[PDB]
Amino acid sequence: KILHRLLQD
Amino acid sequence: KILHRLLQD
Amino acid sequence: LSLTADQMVSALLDAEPPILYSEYDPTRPASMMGLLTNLADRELVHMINWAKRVPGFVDLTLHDQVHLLECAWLEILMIGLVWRSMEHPGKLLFAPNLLLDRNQGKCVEGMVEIFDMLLATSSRFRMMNLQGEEFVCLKSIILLNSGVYTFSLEEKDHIHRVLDKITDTLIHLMAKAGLTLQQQHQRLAQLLLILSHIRHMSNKGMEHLYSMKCKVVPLSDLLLEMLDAHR
Amino acid sequence: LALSLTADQMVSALLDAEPPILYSEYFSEASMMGLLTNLADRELVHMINWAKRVPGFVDLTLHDQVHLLECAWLEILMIGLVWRSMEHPGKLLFAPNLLLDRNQGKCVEGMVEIFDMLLATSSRFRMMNLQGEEFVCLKSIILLNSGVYTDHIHRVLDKITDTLIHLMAKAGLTLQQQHQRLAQLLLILSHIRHMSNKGMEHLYSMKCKNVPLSDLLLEMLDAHR
Ligand SMILES: CS[C@H]1CCCC(=C(c2ccc(O)cc2)c2ccc(O)cc2)C1
Ligand SMILES: CS[C@H]1CCCC(=C(c2ccc(O)cc2)c2ccc(O)cc2)C1
């Protein structure tokens, strides 16, 4: 999930 | 419509 | 709405529809959706006459009453279901003779997701220790709120006037229960945040019923008109 | 940390966490949804960081953070839209360079219904004289509440309620006027939920009947399918 990566910026 | 009739009843 | 909160509560309590039974037979295990449909179809007839006894509802025009029911009928059914099943953990009580499990929900495809949220809602009422006086208020709020913004020039301030009266009624209930001013707003908020879940469950559910209409679950003549109003 | 914050400290943090008002590219079926998809895709990226700047949201598990965002992402975009379009009656301000009315909604099938619901919500905020401090509280509530049922969150939800009341404790509102206005604001959230679901089903209608969606938007969409 892209949201995974974006939620740990 | 039935809803109109049952509300009118 | 020239009536105190105590008179408000009692009126809503007296207007309460009965708990109907289903045609379910334990000896016999699509089939389940047939039972629920016939159950809901008979529940509707009681809801329509219940709505008439809700303070302020009959003051409205016929066309407005029709819309408010068309848009909220499943919400009112679902919150009724959640309330009945409140003291039955992990189970939904559609009827005294129809107590269902998180295993018979798979007997209908795509229903297992709806059951989850319904069970979660029931578990929320349980943890909050919801009172009947609060439930009958929430039910009447849904009836009067689920429409309005889906609508001579009306003047819908009457609905909001009744809605504000139902709010004061809830506050009056909690205050007599010993809740502090802070605890009252919190519970008020928590209760009304539930309605923003019943809406969700209704929408999801509603779309599941529109799917079955296009086939093997022949809906009643009333349910079809309540369903077409959402398309 | 959220619970140990003050009401004013809650508002100040939320006000500072606000995402920016993005612009769109500078109509028809494809033309309309094309610009909206692009706009929304860029807004999501700002929303994600906005959510991480929301008190109590960081304390949640990564999975729970994901689930909450997947649930309320359209609600949050919509309440944003509704709030921006507040001082533009009868029109939707998707972007400062993109103001749309109901007549333009007829470019896409079944969008006129969702447009009127949005215009009605925006109208109700204006008639209620909704404040910016209240708006940031409501969207925070939508984030935490919409997918908590499907404990710590409730402790934070109760804090935003206290914050909302504190806002109404200011501006000289009666206790009666406080829990009535509180009730009115929270009942609107029910309608924002409805518009989202009806919006979501229209997006999935567009996904199958092939404007191309972004990978990010496509993944937020599959969480509802
Ligand atoms: C398809 S989703 C399903 C989930 C559980 C609740 C159920 C309802 C339902 C809900 C509450 C209730 O007391 C009686 C009936 C339902 C409504 C109409 C219908 O034709 C069939 C069922 C909807
Ligand atoms: C499908 S109906 C339409 C109704 C108005 C709101 C709209 C949204 C929308 C809402 C708010 C916003 O700022 C940006 C975009 C949307 C979302 C994703 C997408 O690919 C296209 C549009 C959904």
Does the annotation place D67 within a ligand binding site?
no
| d(CA D39, ligand 2 centre) in Å | 8
> Measuring from atom 23 of ligand 2, which residue has the nearest CA?
D199
Chain A CB within 8 Å of residue D69 CB: yes
Question: What's the domain range around C153?
Answer: 1-231
Mark out the alpha helices in chain C (DSSP H runs).
Answer: 5-14, 31-52, 62-84, 111-128, 132-145, 157-176, 181-213, 221-228
- List C-alpha distances in Å: D105 to D102, D114, D221: 5, 9, 22
Residues annotated in a binding site of C: 43, 84, 208
Cα C133 to Cα C10: distance, rounded to the nearest angstrom: 8
- List C-alpha distances in Å: D189 to C61, C195, D39, D79, D219: 26, 9, 23, 9, 24
Whether D115 and D18 have beta carbons less than 8 Å apart is answered as no
Q: C98: part of which helix (H) or strand (E)?
A: strand C98-101
Per the DSSP assignment, residues forming a β-bridge with C95 are C98
Per the DSSP assignment, residues forming a β-bridge with D93 are D99
Cβ neighbours of residue D109 under 8 Å, at least 6 residues apart?
Answer: D29
Task: Provide the CATH number for the domain around residue D9.
Answer: 1.10.565.10
Method of determination is X-ray
Whether D81 and D121 have beta carbons less than 8 Å apart is answered as no
Q: Number of residue pairs across B and C with CB atoms under 8 Å?
A: 25
CB of D114 within 6 A of ligand 2: the answer is yes
> What's the token pair of residue C90?
């992990």
| d(CA D153, ligand 1 centre) in Å | 29
Does the annotation place D224 within a ligand binding site?
no
Q: A3: part of which helix (H) or strand (E)?
A: helix A2-6
CB of C76 within 6 A of ligand 1: the answer is no
Mark out the alpha helices in chain D (DSSP H runs).
Answer: 7-17, 29-52, 62-84, 111-128, 132-145, 152-169, 175-208, 215-222
Cα C79 to Cα D187: distance, rounded to the nearest angstrom: 16
Whether D191 and C149 have beta carbons less than 8 Å apart is answered as yes
Per the DSSP assignment, residues forming a β-bridge with D98 are D95
**Residue written as token pair 């909690």:** C174
Query: Which chains lie within 8 Å of chain D at 3 or more CB pairs, if any?
Result: A, C
Sign of CA dihedral C72, D186, C135, D67: positive
Per the DSSP assignment, residues forming a β-bridge with D101 are D91
Shortest distance, CA A5 to any CA of chain D (angstroms): 10
Tell me the DSSP string of C216-231. Answer: -----HHHHHHHHTT-
Ligand 2 probe mutation, D39, D79, D198, most atoms within 8 A of CB: D39
Cα D35 to Cα C134: distance, rounded to the nearest angstrom: 45
The angle subtended at Cα C199 by Cα C197 and Cα C204, nearest 5°, is 95
Domain total of chain D: 1
Cα D118 to Cα D75: distance, rounded to the nearest angstrom: 11
Which atom of ligand 1 is nearest to C223's Cα?
20
